[PDB]
Amino acid sequence: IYAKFVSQKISKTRWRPLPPGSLQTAETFATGSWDNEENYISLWSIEGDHQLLCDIRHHGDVMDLQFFDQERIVAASSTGCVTVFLHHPNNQTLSVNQQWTTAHYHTSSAPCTGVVCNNPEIVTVGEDGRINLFRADHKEAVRTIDNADSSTLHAVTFLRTPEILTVNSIGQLKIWDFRQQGNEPSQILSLTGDRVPLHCVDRHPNQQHVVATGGQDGMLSIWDVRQGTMPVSLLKAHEAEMWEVHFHPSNPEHLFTCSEDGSLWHWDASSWLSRIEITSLLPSRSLSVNTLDVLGPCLVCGTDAEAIYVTRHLFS
Template identity: 70%
Template sequence: QDNRISIWSVGDLGNVGLNGEYQGEPQLLCDIRHNGDVMDMQFLDQERIVVASSTGDVTIFRHHQNNQTLSANQRWEKAHYHVDRQASCGGAACTGVICNNPEIVTVGEDGRINFFRADQKGAMRTIDNADSSTLHAVTFLRTTEILTVNSIGQLKIWDLRQQRNEPSQILSLTGDRVPLHCVDRHPNQQHIVATGGQDGMLSIWDIRQGTMPVSLLNAHEAEMWEVHFHPSDPDHLFTCSEDGSLWHWDTSTNVSEKPSFLHQGGRSSTYFSHNTINQSVVSAWLSNDPTKDRMEITNLIPNQTLSVNSLDVLGPCLVYGTDAEAIYVNRHLFA
């Protein structure tokens, strides 16, 4: 199978249909062959894209905007591997990548965490046995801290200032060890994290509080593949699933009037986070029951049956890809 990395232009905001769908033809600007399945992708900057491969390779592709071509700029071969890096088939899938230019962190099926810097040849640091199970996703909590999720329902926090290769904190779903597939951190309040996994549930965590999720919300009927807070309006969150649905979770309704209580072990404590632009004083996500009176949930693609594998959101735009081998762009999220 010939896998490719493609750069598209979706044109200007002029041609929009009644339901906010983009009507102009998206244009393929350029593409390039990719070895193995693409497991994850992240822009490092305006021109460079970091790509995780099922072969274990991690590649930086550069988009040359002057002549609309893509080229492989840098590659770390078999950054992830099972037993022997030298073996011809020894690669383990690199499952997740996160960038904070120039730093790149990757996780994989081999339970490894790699720290790379763009333009440096080898890994700056590798935690070989970070996990005995598959690591599925990674995110930065702050510049010196990352969070990983694994296939036995655990979140692990790693303090990059520490030289010892142990997590500084472990949080986990109780009971069944449900594999977690995706994680995102609240853009303004780094202690709030959302995860999703094999059971389709949405879990909201406060990493300052205890080791269990603050709330578990019934969501999809199959695996949740991706979760994203809106980067500039984090009262909105988006999840997509194998069941063919893409949900918009909106906690922005009347939140300011309601204090948020976080119950744990019989104690109730109230947290007032620093007021940030576009955000109520108290985060609705930390309510003990966020769905009560304060959340609207909408399936943005009600008639879809094939898996929605990936999504991203920026400003009024949502883009998602499905098993129909199609990419969809909704340009009027909040219309």
Template identity: 65%
Template sequence: MEGTNAKYVSQKISKTRWRPASSSSLQQPEIFATGSWDNEVNKVSIWSIGENGVSGMEDEFEGDPQLISELKHDGDVLDLQFLDQDKIVTASSSGAVTIYRHHHTNQTLSVSHQWGRAHHYPCDNAPCTGVVCNSPEIVTVGEDGRIVIFRADQEEVIRTIENADSSTIHAVTFLRTTEILTVNSIGQLKLWDLRQQANEPSQILSLTGDRVPLHCVDRHPNQQHIVATGGQDGMLCIWDVRQGNMPFSLMDAHSAEMWEVHFHPSNPDHLFSCSEDGSLWHWETSTNLDTTSFLQSGRTTSVISRSAGALVGENQSLVNAWLTGDSSKGRLETTNMLPSQTLSVNSLDILGQCLVCGTDGEAVYVNRQVPV
């Protein structure tokens, strides 16, 4: 893909995230963070693709990410999220949840706070597998089936849902400010209303048939009832949490595990997914193109749509393109964003026209010309 810069970083990258843009900024993002895994020493690192990050080294090319700060991380970084412009929250294989502070004046990182053993078994630590932030709230999930809620401005844990799941919870996202959605290793989505004191989900959705583990989840930025998930079978699933308990559509996406899926935050007709198979797909849906096929790099993608009739009676202009359910009215094109197949693409993030992803090939890829 034109405009992609590869940076070899000598560590396997498990997570990549753009620093959120300030509300007053109209500029493209310049700063991103990475976390590593499966290395002798794992790290949280801050990178710049702006002029401030240029090192002047002869072997560096314009647009290459430049390392501006890094700090050791105890255990594998299993998830990483910006809490705000200065703070980063990590989920560790050691069970710890850590807040790192990025000091902009001298470009250093420090540990602001850590909750050790936030996730644990009776006799051992349990990996913390996912984190989501809605400042100052932080919600984490883990292999121990717990959901733990923190506040960045308080040292004590706010709430623990002890037996939220009997299986591993792989990921979590906010559906609304008071609701979260989790996905687990037996193919279930669980909706939790944090206003309720009961430790039971308010809704459970699941894939029928084989209990295929779900690894990732993302919410449509404008219509919170629309959710995308991906899992062990590489399928992209689109759900409408208002309509029944099964996915609205299933799309043949990757040939191995899908590790992350993200709607574009300001143009959600574009969606991105990455996989163990070394691919990074850009999905674009449009309802005004006259075609009867779903195109994926020249080959047909199998699409199973469910209960399209459930949308009859709604204002069709408000029906999201992901839920049209009728391939004769829509078109789905996908493009592989990476120049060549690589080892597992573990993580991606998209902001504006800038995309970043990290791989097991010890490389970070940045594209600043994503057509969205």
């Protein structure tokens, strides 16, 4: 593993998707700067080293970033503008094709929380309780669920098409559908009380009912969508709030999670619904981390101390 300085607080880190049937590892990865007066969304490309390819200025703090395809990258700003940074695959340029400025607003400016990436749609959520479902080459959204909850969303995970599951700030996980009538959720799964606040939500690649989430206490909760309304396993890990948490797409036993204390633990259960081995990839000293990406053998993450750790040999 090796770190690289960029003089910018990275708020998101997502690796680029490979082609169909490719046998190589992930070489390109995107990043998102925040907590500054001029946020930018550059894209790096690989002791190891990495150089910057293209960059573009982004208005507002990039709260979430996800790649929709090989040349499309959806980004969630802090002003409610869900601008999809469609990267040009010809001259290798970062431009903007489609953008939705009225995706999250208060009738003020509500900041966009999480944003899912599924071809060919665009599921996102904001602080105003609006679950929009945009698509490609569309001016308006196809479905907008205006939730009347008192809390605010922080993350949104999609299990099956087209029913996603978001997490509020009260530790509850509500499941909604884009083709359903009304603005109420079908299922509601919360924890013990309303003091804990979930910030990350991700489902398994093989199991559509199992999903892992992280509260504001550092305990990784693995709940199910057809096993009551509570968590099946609640195991503590860090001491601060859980930043991002996502498992690997190749193997479902390995799963990484980031916290607000400065520790990138990588759990290895080689089932989550049932002795798990945890190994921290980064040490102390460094500040808290924002997000972390995993694409088989490579691992890219971003810290708050203007650092970006990259390791293309996680199992070698």
